[PDB]
Amino acid sequence: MVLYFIGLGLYDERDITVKGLEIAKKCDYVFAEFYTSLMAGTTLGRIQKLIGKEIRVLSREDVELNFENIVLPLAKENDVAFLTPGDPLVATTHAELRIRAKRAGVESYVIHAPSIYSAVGITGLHIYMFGKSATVAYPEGNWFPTSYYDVIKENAERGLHTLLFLDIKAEKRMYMTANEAMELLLKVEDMKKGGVFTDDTLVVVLARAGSLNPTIRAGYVKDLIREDFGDPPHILIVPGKLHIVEAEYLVEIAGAPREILRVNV
Amino acid sequence: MVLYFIGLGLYDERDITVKGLEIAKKCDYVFAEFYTSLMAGTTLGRIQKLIGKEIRVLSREDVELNFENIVLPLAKENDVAFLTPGDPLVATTHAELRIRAKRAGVESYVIHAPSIYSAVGITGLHIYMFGKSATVAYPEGNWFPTSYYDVIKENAERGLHTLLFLDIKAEKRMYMTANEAMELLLKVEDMKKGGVFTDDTLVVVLARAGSLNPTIRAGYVKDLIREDFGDPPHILIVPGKLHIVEAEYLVEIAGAPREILRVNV
Ligand SMILES: Nc1ncnc2c1ncn2[C@@H]1O[C@H](CSCC[C@H](N)C(=O)O)[C@@H](O)[C@H]1O
């Protein structure tokens, strides 16, 4: 009669909360989805071993089209866990799955976990200063999205920071790098010419948030666009005006140039 | 010899990540602060038992004034952990403490935990649609802070949602309820008269996120300002322009007036 949406956290199998792990172990069935995001620092095998029970992975189609035929039927008569990377209901459309559970007469509870939305706090940027967020998607065929560019412009105009999720092809486990995102942004700038993203734009890159050794780098585009930030996932942030404390953190912890203390503050 | 900033999560001792618990268990000294937020589902004793370590609780002044005098010295010759509610770098000024650590020759690491900043996803609102955030501060004496009202105004003009952290005076055990925040805002509305927050404004309240049965409610201020949402902590949200799917969830899960389904376009 109960369905638990459990977050797996940011990077590896230990990023799940103790609450999530203990509940998952008590469930009769454990499902998981790895298409809304990825756990780059672990494998299905390691997660399965930590929990101690076999996990059935579900495709996007399984969930979006048949959640009520695969998961809900079991949740009606048993305790079922639905594992997802990050925080459940964040950076996904899983919220509506709770409505489906309600209509199926199934109770649902949410076990939270760290999300990149909060983890970016490790960049030293004040969380309250972040504005609207966006995703930098890979251009493909006749679709070349550029909406993210307007998001940055509107946030920066108000001195707010912009969190940019970088595209990911979950199935293939292929991640867009900060470098590629910077390349695309420069191309959108070349077309829109709004003076929003250029070689002199200060950006922050967060790679592998969650690991004990994430890469946290800050600097001007012309300098970071060709830098190696290590393995995925990569997150790109375009800061607005900086508080002196944010800037010093960037300099001290993220190797940002001293110039930002007089240019971006 | 290192310093670990470890988040404990939203509600109880099990909201810590497995990564954080195992690391904390192996630290020589463990410090903590419980003034940046309220964990309503556990006790210091229960946390100590989980980690198997005696915890030295520090006051705001201990941290802001003497962190480098109380914690860092020990971190030079021992593995030290500093625990905080939720995520240590969200809606706190602890990030700055990493700068102190570095200049003290102490390497530091961060272990994330579920944060209210992303847990609000349980309200069904699109997390990417949130704009600048603000804190509703308690007035003190004749000093009446109101800058948070302007934050809502700015986001609303952009159609963005506004996350309102509510004040907390730990030492005085003062935890601002959503009701109190609504009262303060209505008073600020009468002063500035900007049509930003009124009896007819739609708001969302999230109480005790992290618990299995948090309070999730949505409705007009006039109707909710007198409602009992249970014990603190509480977080208040003023949605901007709603998407149909957000409205659907608020109605289905947060018991919002079915009339919001008919969104304005
Ligand atoms: N479990 C919870 N439920 C509802 N609101 C919460 C909450 N935890 C924190 N808050 C909100 O956030 C305020 C603390 S601000 C510090 C937040 C913390 N670092 C985090 O990551 O969550 C509280 O006064 C309250 O308004």
Ligand code: NA
């Ligand atoms: Na945000």
